[PDB]
A paper describes a structure:
Interactions between [name]-11 and [name] are well-characterized and clearly depend on the [name], but the mechanism whereby [name]-11 engages [name] has been still unresolved. The structure shows that [name] and [name] engage different [name]-11 residues and interfaces without overlapping.
The tips of two loops in EC2 (around residue A125 and residues S175, T177, respectively) are in close contact with residues located on the apex of the HAd11K (in particular residues N190 and N192). Several putative hydrogen bonds are predicted in this region which likely contributes to the binding. Several hydrogen bonds and salt bridges are also predicted in this area. The interacting regions of rDSG2 on HAd11K are strikingly similar to the one found for HAd7K and HAd3K, two other adenoviruses which are using [name] as their cellular receptor. Indeed, HAd11K and HAd7K are very similar in sequence (92.9% identity), and the interacting residues with rDSG2 are very well conserved at the exception of the D300 in HAd11K which is replaced by V300 in HAd7K.
Numbering used by the authors:
A (entry chain A), C (entry chain C), D (entry chain B): 129 to 325
B (entry chain E): 110 to 135, 147 to 194, 205 to 332
E (entry chain D): 108 to 136, 147 to 194, 205 to 331
Write the structure that this text describes.
């Protein structure tokens, strides 16, 4: 009954993702949940800033940062390459179910729907949406999200790919120095066709 | 170091972790100093010496170039990074009172000038204005050229006119740069027509 | 298969919630459906105007209204404090499945993901979105929706909370006195991490 | 598990829908996936242009095109009236299952929630959204999406209707004649209350 | 094949959706074909070779780009000319041109023209989709001024009907909103933000 989720847990104790390649250690919490809904997978992603370099972004007008998830042939997470450094797992209450994942492949984007290195179908690999940032003054600041599915595989061990880029390009930064506390993106839910189990 | 002054470039609006350049020395690298030193738009990998971009996206319109003073440890060197321009600023028609006049029975005349402002790099295809006739010139009477020395729309008439006819020569035009708009502003471009009135001289 | 839904029922015959503080009795119908999708709950809400005062909001330019749902430790709707005055229940055809609910706690927002009275995690208690009002001339007016999850328990018996605020601020009223028929908002769907059963 | 989906498959070999009534034969691949989610149905729809006339649309500033899906009383696609000419079916890997379906009715729009020929409830039959078109220069042009559920049963055999209208109105044509490759709109996910099995 | 008429005339609304019946071409004695089209681009009309019903194509008609189409259609077993006018829908928000608006009132004068506001709308000239409808956004709670719409040039004639005493320096400055007489089309309603335009009144 719980094998239909594959997520990162709720509010991990420590950072589990390195989004900024400049940071020396994990600089944010990436909360990613994947749910099997028939032939589709519902993906529920957002980020909580932990490091100061990551939180200072709200003081700038043009910001962009990407989380890259690479999965091997069986759908396990490649922590040596991915932004997320903690392997995904099933739901055990409000935590990750410590145990072996045997049906990870079912949660991965379909290579049929989102092919690799196929220029003719390149446009099929893109998804778009908008999340929000709640300012210290209660205003909703929109953040564009671009998701790229299995379109490129740099490392030979990569069989599936998911890149989620949060970017905003406005005229006034959401925060000023003395007001910026943390960067929390409103949850983004996107659907993608899933690979056969 | 292999060169007292290195020189590289990186495109405006480039994504995170775009390899701006690589600092070579004959080793631990480090940015001794920056100029203007704000925002923090570049990152220097101390192990390999490669300067990449960061999450704080660049804007040529805010800073045209950056100077970095770097060091190698086991001397100081200069690194000049030029920000290449992209067409991410839509033209704005400065003047609103655009009322030209045509002399009766004249051809090859300069009806008026349309002032245009573009924040992009001066002298580039990202800054020259390209004019097209949204309406009012279906009969092929007026001609608009782009004066690149000032980025102005020279509006000239080539066809005759009879004052007694009082033909409605007013027309509405739209403005875009010579080069195609950058991907960040396309789908936001909205070419609102700018009217110009053509008065017929008595 | 029907124990995975808690909803208000499709088109209740009589009004089931009180959406305006100025209303003396029930003044609209709040269609609210919650579906368990793995570790998430998919919420699906909209309001159908019934009272004349509520239906007359279509003739204004700056409107907002909030529905507040409060749930006890067992997830039952606190009809005395909440706007919706009819308890939620499982699916039985297109009607509420009259009977006792025991798994209600599973549908409520998680207190680990969405905490009470925590100033360090206030931002992660907001969901945002847009629905639409279809006018008489078929023009679609957007309505901003702010959903606040468990962030404040005014009453002692409140253990979970959902506040759905609709608001529009337009330059031309969607309707005039002679054309307004009813304020029906197009369905709005959001997601939230669900508390353990 | 496979009986919870009803879809057109992933990347059909040949065009299976005729969006443009002018086109002689099938002119687009319409990917559509309906998944049961408790009391709701998750619809996942997009189009892939095939014919030259269809792909020309990327070179024009103002366009709109509609896809109609008419279903009988049992939930079987009326291929001779609808745009899609290939019946929907259950999941078999990435392809449509071969066999009869007895529970297609469950996937249809609720005639209670979304009535036929009732003006007083007309506003309830609309759903709105936005998808995107990724152009050759990596720019996402928005596309307005208007989904009308059961509103009008033109023919005596039509018991359910789904009308999905894509449209865009821009100031710069997304493509030029020399760069247009294929009109592919990004996936659109919407939800509607489903009819009792 | 014999055409029933040498010239057919029809009409189709602007922004009409795809597969909207523009008209029908009758012929008696048949396969119909669009020989030619002026201005020949974009392909906004489709002729049913079986029935002769001209429909609109997915390419939405824009009247502000082309106000009339001329189709030459040949019937086969001679060509007929069909003139399809495009009817205006209010898809243009009027815009006030003069960004520097300053009024002047003579002391103790009534029934005088105070100012003229120049406005531009791109829809059909002479129609309710083009004439400006002015409303007082603010400042005229005292009931001093009145705005009329000069339809000859679509201008806002602002007149005053009350006397003023210079020694007062009463603040008569106000702010108006400009909109067309006919209601905005469903495509541009909900995209209309009536940013009030200001006008300062200086008493001589």
């Amino acid at each position: 009954d719980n094998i239909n989720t594959l997520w990162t847990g709720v509010n991990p104790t420590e950072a589990n993702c390195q989004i900024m390649n400049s940071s020396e250690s994990n600089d944010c919490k990436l909360i990613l949940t994947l749910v099997k809904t028939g032939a589709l997978v519902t993906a529920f992603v957002y980020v909580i800033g932990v490091s100061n370099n990551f939180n200072m972004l709200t003081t700038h007008r043009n910001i962009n940062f990407t989380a890259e998830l690479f999965f091997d042939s069986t759908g396990n997470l490649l922590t040596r390459l991915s932004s997320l450094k903690t392997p995904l797992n099933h739901k055990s209450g409000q935590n990750m179910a410590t145990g072996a994942i045997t049906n990870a492949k079912g949660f991965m984007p379909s290579t049929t729907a989102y092919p690799f290195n196929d220029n003719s179908r390149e446009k099929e690999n893109y998804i778009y949406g908008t999340c929000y940032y709640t300012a210290s003054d209660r205003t909703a600041f929109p953040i564009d999200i671009s998701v790229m599915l299995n379109r490129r595989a740099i490392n030979d061990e990569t069989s599936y790919c998911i890149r989620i880029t949060w970017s905003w390009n406005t005229g006034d930064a959401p925060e000023v120095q003395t007001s910026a506390t943390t960067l929390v993106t409103s949850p983004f839910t996107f659907y993608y066709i899933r690979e056969d189990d | 170091f292999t060169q007292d002054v290195f020189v590289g470039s990186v495109e405006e609006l480039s994504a995170a972790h775009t390899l701006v350049m690589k600092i070579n020395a004959t080793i631990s690298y480090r940015i001794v100093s920056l100029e203007p030193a704000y925002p923090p738009v570049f990152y220097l990998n101390k192990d390999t010496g490669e300067i990449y971009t960061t999450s704080v996206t660049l804007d040529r319109e805010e800073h045209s170039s950056y100077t970095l003073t770097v060091e190698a440890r086991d001397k100081q060197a200069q690194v000049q990074i030029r920000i290449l321009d992209v067409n991410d600023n839509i033209p704005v028609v400065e003047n609103k009172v655009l009322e030209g006049m045509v002399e009766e029975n004249q051809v090859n005349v300069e009806v008026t000038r349309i002032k245009v402002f573009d924040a992009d790099e001066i002298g580039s295809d990202n800054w020259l204005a390209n004019f097209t006739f949204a309406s009012g010139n279906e009969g092929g009477y007026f001609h608009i050229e782009t004066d690149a020395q000032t980025n102005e729309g020279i509006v000239t008439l080539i066809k005759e006119v009879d004052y007694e006819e009082m033909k409605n020569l007013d027309f509405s035009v739209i403005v875009a740069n010579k080069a195609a708009f950058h991907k960040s502003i396309r789908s936001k471009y909205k070419p609102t027509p700018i009217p110009i009135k053509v008065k017929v001289k008595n």
